[PDB]
Design a protein around this nucleic acid. Structure first.
Ligand SMILES: Nc1ncnc2c1ncn2[C@@H]1O[C@H](COP(=O)(O)OP(=O)(O)O)[C@@H](O)[C@H]1O
Ligand code: BEF
Ligand SMILES: [Mg+2]
Length: 509
DNA sequence: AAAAAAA
């Protein structure tokens, strides 16, 4: 369809709750709720989104705004407004459906809705139910029946599982569709589900198949999403709202970025520990940080080290997809509340998760996708606070830092090399209690992980994978050693006819 | 065998 740009404007008349109230856009009850949150003033994207999202019964909406700049309320407020605008029509039906790439994010958005509810008990009538995977279906549906929610937040899969069973009962009158972190939801493995959801909701709707308004939000998107969103967009023209200049980088300016480069990938483990150690001393245990890792196993493994190396000083929270949803929710709450501590996680906590007052965002290795570099370091410097970011890598990963400059215009001015002392190496290797068999899996996971993103990050397959592989030897403290595997397994890997596979592995059946 | 996400 037709895309209409609305570029960033420096000379723009401000927008406030009071103005939007006096202008008649916002009813008193939502104003009352948002004002009590005692924000200085509406963030750019909020000022730019609210009126348009409510404005025409036509145009779809895309909105780009940097991390932690209030993109949530930027659509949660208009929704509530729309709910107030139609309180006598279909008062027991879902009118707004919000979708998010992870469960914790969905639950977080739900919690935000609950905050809105908390700031004004008059808005509790507009009930809200979350539909995410890893929780009891029956209970969720019991909640659905009980409350008759006007707002649903969900993850695609469970939402499909709900729709295929109860599309007629709750979802026959949706008017708004919200894709938070829209770009991720349009990636492979998500897009089909979103297209399915879109199809079902459009098919089921009573007024028309083009009734629903679609809202796309993310810190990272371009026009190339609209080509990917074409099948889920209904309206004839799309409203692109951008709080960022076209040339300007998507990364947040207030983030103090740096990158530590090592000879080997394993070294980055030593660099991170030495860095954290320095911070705890200089900050007197007043340290709140998030550290990212490529895989679940490397996360869990890194957690062991950090626990052995820093549990005297701080709490170490392990956070990844293989954690049960209860533990995830609880630890998320704890890290949200706690003043200090270290959150060791995969990319489950890369997008959208708002942990207040995080000092530093560390990264061992590279993200699952280029864009997720922006989101990762986005976990800090949120809501007007300052923040720092450190990227721990080795030379064989440097083509990634280059691709950060080429694609996203992101330049890390602060670079420096790193080589570990024998002391720190001894200290860390002493902190490893994992058997060789486990180390094997841990490194293999990294091999598999880094293999998948070679084409994406411009890596040299012949140079990168053996480096990742030698980690095994480094951890077992025998550099010349190779990972012991069976021929059939290496054949499953498909590297049996490769010099690399021979260079990284030792067939020991 | 490799974030996440449907069991
Ligand atoms: N208008 C505002 N002024 C100041 N802080 C805000 C405002 N709106 C939201 N926030 C804060 O921003 C934090 C995270 O914002 P979020 O909605 O996650 O932004 P994004 O989705 O763009 O990352 C929340 O803790 C919230 O309290
Ligand atoms: F809305 Be964002 F993903 F916090
Ligand atoms: Mg964000």
């Amino acid at each position: 369809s037709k895309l209409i740009h609305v570029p960033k404007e420096d000379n723009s008349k401000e927008v406030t709750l009071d103005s939007l109230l006096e202008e008649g856009v916002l009813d008193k009850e939502i104003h009352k709720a948002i004002t009590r949150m005692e924000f200085p003033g509406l963030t750019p994207v909020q000022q730019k989104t609210i009126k348009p999202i409510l404005s025409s019964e036509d145009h779809d909406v895309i909105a780009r705004a940097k991390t932690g700049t209030g993109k949530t309320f930027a659509f949660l407020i208009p929704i509530f407004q729309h709910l107030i605008n139609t309180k006598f029509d279909s008062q027991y039906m879902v009118k707004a459906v919000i979708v998010a790439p992870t469960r914790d994010l969905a639950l977080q958005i739900e919690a935000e809705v609950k905050k809105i509810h908390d700031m004004n008990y008059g808005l509790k009538k507009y009930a809200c139910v979350s539909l995410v995977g890893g929780t009891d279906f029956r209970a969720a549906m019991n909640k659905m029946n009980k409350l008759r929610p006007n707002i649903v937040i969900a993850t695609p899969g469970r939402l499909i599982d709900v729709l295929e069973k109860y599309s007629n009962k709750f979802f026959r009158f949706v008017d708004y569709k919200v894709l938070d972190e829209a770009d991720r939801l349009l990636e492979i493995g998500f897009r089909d589900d979103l297209e399915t959801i879109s199809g079902i909701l459009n098919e089921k709707n009573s007024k028309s198949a083009d009734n629903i308004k679609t809202l796309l939000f993310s810190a990272t998107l371009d026009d190339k999403v609209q080509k990917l969103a074409n099948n889920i967009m209904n309206k004839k023209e799309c409203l692109f709202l951008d709080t960022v200049d076209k040339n300007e980088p998507e990364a947040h300016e207030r983030i103090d970025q740096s990158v530590v480069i090592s000879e080997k990938f394993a070294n980055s483990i030593f660099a991170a520990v030495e860095h954290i150690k320095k911070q705890i001393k200089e900050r007197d245990s007043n340290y709140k940080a998030i550290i990212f890792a490529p895989t679940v196993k490397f996360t869990s493994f890194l957690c062991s080290i950090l626990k052995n190396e820093f549990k005297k000083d701080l709490p170490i929270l392990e956070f990844h997809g293989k954690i049960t949803q209860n533990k995830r929710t609880s630890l998320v709450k704890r890290f949200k509340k706690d003043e200090s501590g270290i959150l060791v996680c995969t990319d489950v906590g890369a997008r959208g998760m708002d942990f207040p007052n995080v000092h530093e965002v560390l990264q061992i290795g590279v993200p699952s996708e280029l864009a997720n570099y922006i989101h990762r370091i986005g976990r800090t410097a949120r809501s007007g606070k300052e923040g720092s970011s450190v990227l721990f890598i080795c030379k064989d990963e440097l083509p990634f830092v280059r691709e950060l400059e080429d694609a996203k215009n992101i330049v890390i001015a602060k670079q420096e090399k790193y080589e570990p002392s024998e002391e720190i190496k001894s200290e860390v290797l002493e902190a490893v209690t994992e058997e060789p068999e486990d180390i094997s899996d841990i490194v293999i996971s990294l091999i598999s992980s880094y293999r998948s993103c070679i084409k994406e990050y411009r890596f040299s397959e012949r140079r990168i994978l053996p480096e990742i592989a030698s980690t095994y030897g480094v951890l077992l403290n025998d550099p010349q050693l190779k990972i012991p595997v069976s021929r059939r397994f290496l054949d499953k890997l498909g590297l049996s006819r490769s010099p690399i596979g021979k260079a990284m592995f030792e067939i020991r059946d």
